[PDB]
Amino acid sequence: DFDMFRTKNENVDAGRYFAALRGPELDEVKDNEDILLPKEEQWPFLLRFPIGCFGICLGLSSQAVLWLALAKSPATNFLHITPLINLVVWLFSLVVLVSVSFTYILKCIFYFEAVKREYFHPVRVNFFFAPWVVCMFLAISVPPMFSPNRKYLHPAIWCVFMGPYFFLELKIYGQWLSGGKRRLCKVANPSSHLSVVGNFVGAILASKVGWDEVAKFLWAVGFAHYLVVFVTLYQRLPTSEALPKELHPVYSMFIAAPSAASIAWNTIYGQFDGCSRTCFFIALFLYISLVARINFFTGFKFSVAWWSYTFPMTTASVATIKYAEAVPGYPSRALALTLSFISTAMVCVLFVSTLLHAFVWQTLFPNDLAIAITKRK
Amino acid sequence: DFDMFRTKNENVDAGRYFAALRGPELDEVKDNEDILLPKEEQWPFLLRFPIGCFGICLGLSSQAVLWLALAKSPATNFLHITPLINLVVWLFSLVVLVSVSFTYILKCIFYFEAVKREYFHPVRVNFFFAPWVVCMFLAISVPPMFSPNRKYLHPAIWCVFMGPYFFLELKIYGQWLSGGKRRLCKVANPSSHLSVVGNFVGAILASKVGWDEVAKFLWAVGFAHYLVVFVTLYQRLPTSEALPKELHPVYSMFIAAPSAASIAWNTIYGQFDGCSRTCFFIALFLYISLVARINFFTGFKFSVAWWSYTFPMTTASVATIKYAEAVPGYPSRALALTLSFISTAMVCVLFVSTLLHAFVWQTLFPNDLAIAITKRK
Amino acid sequence: DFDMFRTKNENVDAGRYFAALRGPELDEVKDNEDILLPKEEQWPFLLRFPIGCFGICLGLSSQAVLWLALAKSPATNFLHITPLINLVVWLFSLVVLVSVSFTYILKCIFYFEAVKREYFHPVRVNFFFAPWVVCMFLAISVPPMFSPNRKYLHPAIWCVFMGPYFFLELKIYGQWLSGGKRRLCKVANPSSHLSVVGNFVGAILASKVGWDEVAKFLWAVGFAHYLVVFVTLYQRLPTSEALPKELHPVYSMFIAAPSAASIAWNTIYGQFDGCSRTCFFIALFLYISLVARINFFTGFKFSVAWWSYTFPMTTASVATIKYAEAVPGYPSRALALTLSFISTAMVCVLFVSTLLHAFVWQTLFPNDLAIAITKRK
Ligand SMILES: CC(C)CCC[C@@H](C)[C@H]1CC[C@H]2[C@@H]3CC=C4C[C@@H](OC(=O)CCC(=O)O)CC[C@]4(C)[C@H]3CC[C@]12C
Ligand SMILES: CC(C)CCC[C@@H](C)[C@H]1CC[C@H]2[C@@H]3CC=C4C[C@@H](OC(=O)CCC(=O)O)CC[C@]4(C)[C@H]3CC[C@]12C
Ligand SMILES: CC(C)CCC[C@@H](C)[C@H]1CC[C@H]2[C@@H]3CC=C4C[C@@H](OC(=O)CCC(=O)O)CC[C@]4(C)[C@H]3CC[C@]12C
Ligand SMILES: [Cl-]
Ligand SMILES: [Cl-]
Ligand SMILES: [Cl-]
């Protein structure tokens, strides 16, 4: 009954995924579709654990970077924040990463057919890049107590975390520019921004190890693929529910890239110039359009994907503290504090609601029917 | 007979507009379409006054900026032009703006159903931005006689004219990036450039009031939406007559944005550097392609839209006088004079022909049948 | 039998070319198509000489620039290369250009109907720009022995070679932005990059004659048309074989433009800054993706188009020697030598195989059936 997904269902085209699945994330089966697995009896645990549980790590590792700059930035020195907030968040986020990583490796050893189904899913494919972006955020945020009294980190740290990321993006980018079944015009969705943001995060790590020329190379590659993905989202593409007819929290993924580019540019050249200010000012316009409404707060439903919509907001807050240093004053101090407060509050709500579902309602790991769709209809 | 358009016809999709209307501006009914109003008997005056009469103001307020720089620029000081040309043009343009604004407000108070029809017209929608761009050109061009002996203008002038413009563009830009019925790929036309040029014109006004950081923010937003609209016009879009098969005066709208960006960049940083020279040199290439032909002059027919094709040519002339200051010489003096002469001559022809039609042929306000199309066919 | 192609078959739409032709270059007739000429009897010689024999000149004139920098660059002065390699290659390439040019002029005087068929071919149209790019490479590479002891060249050389190129691109670019039958979305192919690279090559020549402002203007125009052609190749276009489903040597045409822009920028401003490093670093990423595989070498078949895939690789090597001067060291010396060796080896293989086919197998000038397709089907 469950032996088809066990380790030893051919690769289904992305068109079938868009035709049989509905929703902003393609995680629900339509009403005329038949699945290959039972719909009522509980499934094995390792078959209902999605690849999207790595988004919790992205939401906690990005909050450690923010609180290290708050307690050390010259623009925030009027308040006195203890350095122990970064220590606690940095240790807590590391524990969660190890638990999520160890559980997914077990699934690959026992259920490898289900892992291949998620790889070919047009939306879930971008979450195979997130395991390495969480490790780069944790390395540019190490608590001073644990850091050696040296100016630079060992270059071997950059090679171990940016190696697999570069290998994966070499294959994916080649497919985009070709005329195959998996070209950008056939798969491009709002979540396709996770395969670009990792170029700018790795540029910061390269500078911190003493390799400035390598950082410049990674900035140029991330810049060429963000404009292709940014202009491609305004054209006519496959019809589906991956593009909500109204403004919906999924559009926050368009802010991560510009904010990280501004932060990465200021670290390579030492100053917040006309390039970082343009990157920072593009991401700030998008922040207002998505957050300056009243339905953004009134309409809020819990989901595991919510953990992936908060990390692009905590990154825009890190770039606002760098901008306040280049332009000292009261207009900039208030802007930095306002964005930081909103991001932290959004993460506190998700923390409480996640525990209530797990140990008070027991509805956090339902069956994953989106991976049992038929290949032919 | 006329009570359906009176103040108290549902919102028709942009597809219906493209299917029932023909021409470079979508102002004529096809030969198989039926209208909802009489086609022979004269209509009420307020029902045949379009929103495109604000283009006359754009053609006269942009000519006052040119003649203030001609009499004050160091590169033009060999000729001796009286400062009284700017005074006369500046006062004349203000009178026309007040008369056009007061007449359209009356239509909204008595015929509000016809105003909503123009708002949803894919081409006429961009002319709701023009009432504020005419007021910003008049504020950066005030005749010295009326100006106070101070270095900066009061910041309240910027807030009163750029406030409504920012509010309107927040709503429109949000629709472009969503998956609704009014996304750019469904409505994008050559006239869609009027909703972007106002970001660069407001950046100049911000600098003149002492707010340089605000000007930089408005430059970044205008730059992100011009590349989306510039690359989107080369793709496959709804089939209609909004894109002439040959070069036609409507393509002059592609020059306004690059010329204003170069002028706005030189005011924020004080020098004509490698950014202003690239913006200026892109707009100059387009000027030659559209004006260096012989059919541009042989084929000329009077229209009220002609008043909206001249303002992008008078702006390219203002950027040519700024460039002549950074590069003094005879090659630059001749270039500035040549472009200025052509723009002024084009506006003199429209001035005489407009009066002849009004008081010698009485054919300037025909019935507007493009707003009476049926919603269902 | 051959009188229809003789000098005195209407202009066939680009759609017919894509529907009746197959292959990465549109040079083979499909299996259900009928031709207008005999398929077995040998044709006249002047009717089987394509416009793509000018690609041999591009492969030999670009190799003279490389070997002049190797013997004169400060970064390569540890090795001692004789200046006589540039002299021999420069003289040999000039002889080939004169022979190819004289043969094609004869065809136009006797077979003008076949020349018009190649002009309207969506792929062969871009090879009408190559006759002038070969003359600009030969003028920025003149052997010192033949050069006058002056700092600058005569400006008349720039006018005679860049005049015809500018005239041709004025007409083509106008068609792209219009709504006609030959707009970019209807014809855009990988070979469309040859009509843009000539703007950057002419900028270098302008600087060498003392006209720096003219060079800046040509850089801005080439930059605006490369982003349109670069983003347009990721959209949904006419279905055909012009876009191979896998990585194929034809994709090397995407490297020529970025490499020449970096070289041209360093000559206008004197230094390899953050603009040349971004252009250079984008072209280097594409080089790895196309050359760092094992099927690039195992799968190699001789073709006359191979001569047009090597010139974009010899240009990326010229930009690597300029970068090694701005960043002296051993990491940069090895990179420059590695790319130069590969480009030279690829050209030596094509040289031997071209002579074997001509005088050992007699299969170098087959009948050109792609120009005899019917216009109606
Ligand atoms: C990467 C994503 C987030 C997009 C945001 C930035 C980009 C759109 C790039 C492309 C063009 C760049 C601008 C183009 C040219 C310049 C001039 C550049 O060099 C100068 O000439 C110095 C000017 C000065 O500061 O005086 C200063 C930065 C700036 C404005 C650039 C800022 C960054 C821009 C907007
Ligand atoms: C806004 C519309 C009208 C488009 C026209 C301008 C843009 C296409 C931007 C994006 C990239 C920019 C260029 C990219 C990088 C630079 C380097 C920039 O910074 C430097 O490195 C200084 C170089 C120098 O002047 O020495 C100088 C301006 C320039 C050429 C920029 C000019 C403005 C460009 C062409
Ligand atoms: C032409 C093709 C091959 C594309 C490759 C280059 C372009 C994508 C342009 C557009 C935006 C440009 C960049 C945008 C802004 C700048 C800042 C510009 O001006 C500065 O502010 C100086 C910064 C410094 O060097 O300190 C320096 C070059 C650079 C990075 C530009 C490099 C060239 C870019 C990437
Ligand atoms: Cl950081
Ligand atoms: Cl001004
Ligand atoms: Cl050279």
Author numbering:
A (entry chain A), B (entry chain C), C (entry chain B): 105 to 112, 148 to 516
Sentences from the paper on this structure:
Slow anion channel associated 1 (SLAC1) is a slow (S)-type anion channel that generates anion (Cl- and nitrate) efflux on the guard cell plasma membrane and acts as a key effector of stomatal closure. Trimeric SLAC1 harbors N-terminal and C-terminal intracellular domains (ICDs) with the transmembrane domain (TMD) positioned in the middle. Multiple serine/threonine phosphorylation in the N-terminal and C-terminal intracellular domains activates SLAC120,21,27,28.
We also determined the open state of AtSLAC1 WT and the closed state of AtSLAC1 8D with C3 symmetry, at resolution of 3.8 Å and 2.7 Å, respectively. By contrast, the cryo-EM map of AtSLAC1 8D exhibited a clear density for the latch with the sequence of 105DF(S107D)MFRTK112, revealing features for unequivocal modeling: an apparent N-terminal direction due to a right-helical turn and side chain orientation; readily discernible densities of the aromatic amino acid pattern (F/Y)xx(F/Y)R; distinct density of the phosphomimetic mutation S107D compared to that of the corresponding S107 in the AtSLAC1 S59A31. F106A/F109A and 4D, but not 8G, in the background of AtSLAC1 8D increased current densities compared to AtSLAC1 8D itself.
